[PDB]
Amino acid sequence: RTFFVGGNWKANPKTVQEAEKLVEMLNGAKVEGNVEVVVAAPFAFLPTLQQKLRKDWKVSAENVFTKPNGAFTGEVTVPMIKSFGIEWTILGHSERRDILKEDDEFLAAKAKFALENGMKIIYCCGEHLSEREAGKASEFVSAQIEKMIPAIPAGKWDDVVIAYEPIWAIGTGKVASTQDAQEMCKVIRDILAAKVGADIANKVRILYGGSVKPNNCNELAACPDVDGFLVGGASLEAGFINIVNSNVHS
Ligand code: NA
Secondary structure (H helix, E strand, C coil), rough: CCCCEEEEECCCCCCCCHHHHHHHHHHHCCCCCCCEEEEEHHHHHHHHHHHHHCCCCCEECCCCCCCCCCCCCCCCCHHHCCCCCCEEEECCHHHHHHCCCCCCCHHHHHHHEEEEEEEEEEEEEECCHHHHHHHCCCHHHHHHHHHHHHHCCCCCCHHHEEEEEEEHHCCCCCCHHHHHHCCCCCCCHHHHHHHHCCCCHHHEEEECCCCCCCCCCHHHHCCCCCCCCEEEHHHHHHHHHHHHHHHHHC
């Protein structure tokens, strides 16, 4: 598996002029090793990233809707994204599940629609504090992945990346360890192996999507089942390149 680093800008930066400055910084970064890099940005900034970002990396949307077009005011759709040459989207990020109330049925429909229309997806999952403290993390994450699995069209697993988010460690007063990252990425790989087979489990990149910074990326990357990262705030900073370059420890 090729190490994979996605930079999720989330709803940032505030201005397209800042977005262009960030792209200029990224374009001069010296990448070491072997790594697949994707940068996800707000919809309004996708055209300028697609125009200006280094072509050895790829641009990603942060969401898409379930339909090609139509009477869905405010939604952006897969064909719109693709018409710029953009090939990636994030789906099911904890912020969209938990704040914008996207449920698993909605997300499964997005995954199917995106994949059957030639997108690649970064599909996010992860358990909350109650399930973590009950000792039911693997059961919760399995339920999420089991909803995702039937949505993946035949022959499309090459275009699926899964990100694990330790939601239990976001705004809760608890922090995740490196061992927690390894354990939960391994849990996901074992769910894949049991439900769709070892061949698929061995090729799907499973990312850690907790807090990833220059000070912990190397140790996280070295974990055997951690295939990369879905990076939050550090993707807006020069430290993103440290994280990209952590692949050499994997
Ligand atoms: Na690794």
